[PDB]
Design a protein around this ligand. Structure first.
Ligand SMILES: Cc1cc(=S)c(O)co1
Ligand SMILES: [Zn+2]
Length: 257
């Protein structure tokens, strides 16, 4: 089945998911010189005060921190979006080394990891129906650079020992995702896709310009997770990123000058 290795990695996905070679795939390189400022964009509105985290799950390709999305508790709106998108989960993609790990790049620069906060458009009723639509999702992407620790990340780092292998989950209530955000909400935006199979083209990407700093020890702990299940040979969960894909007939817009 799909993964990130030589025999089942990004270069193979198109055989089971032909949309891998579609017209709006993600991630992409963000060429900051060619991203035009769009003064009709709005400030983003990130309303996470009432976020209800539930659980953390190692799904065999990342760990997802999941939220109660059965009411408008943690929502994204404004910016490029029409209407209201509800937070369902966040996750990261990261490298085996601090020089790689992000999916988006910025003038070909790779960051050590990238956080994705995944939201679905409430006009579609739930996540499953939203992923059948070209405006079903909004993903807020945030780059991680290695430097000072990110205090708000530490409760995620400290539970990873309990979900080392594929299929393990742990209670993860009362986590506040506001502690993962940088100071500025300046962003780039473009239409794209999920970056994992099934690679569906549902996503308004909103990628923050300001990275967050995380400590080398924090990202080291991500790299101790396993892609395999318990009792299977150990394969460290590293390099779970898809490389930049062709921009095709797309323009990336900037919310800032
Ligand atoms: C739904 C979903 C979204 C992203 S961004 C991902 O990597 C996996 O699954
Ligand atoms: Zn992702």
């Amino acid at each position: 089945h799909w993964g990130y290795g030589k025999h089942n990695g990004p270069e193979h996905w198109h055989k089971d998911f032909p949309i891998a070679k579609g017209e709006r795939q993600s991630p992409v390189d963000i060429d900051t010189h060619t991203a035009k400022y769009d003064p009709s964009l709005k400030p983003l509105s990130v309303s996470y005060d009432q976020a209800t985290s539930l659980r953390i799950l190692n799904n065999g390709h990342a760990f997802n921190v999941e939220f109660d999305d059965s009411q408008d508790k943690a929502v994204l709106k404004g910016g490029p979006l029409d209407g209201t998108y509800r937070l369902i989960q966040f996750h990261f993609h990261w490298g085996s080394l601090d020089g790689q790990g992000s999916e988006h790049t910025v003038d070909k620069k790779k960051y050590a990891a990238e956080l994705h906060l995944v939201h679905w458009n409430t006009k579609y009723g739930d996540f499953g129906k939203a992923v059948q639509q070209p405006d079903g999702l909004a993903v807020l992407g945030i780059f991680l650079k290695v430097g000072s620790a990110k205090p708000g990340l530490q409760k995620v780092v400290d539970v990873l020992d309990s979900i080392k292998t594929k299929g393990k989950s742990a209670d993860f209530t009362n986590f506040d995702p506001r502690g993962l955000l940088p100071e500025s909400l300046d962003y780039w935006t473009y239409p794209g896709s999920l970056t994992t199979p099934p690679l569906l083209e549902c996503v308004t990407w909103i990628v923050l310009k300001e990275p967050i700093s995380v400590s080398s020890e924090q990202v080291l702990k991500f790299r101790k997770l396993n892609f395999n299940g318990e009792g299977e040979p150990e394969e460290l969960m590293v390099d779970n990123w898809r490389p930049a894909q062709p921009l095709k007939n797309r323009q990336i817009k900037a919310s800032f000058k």
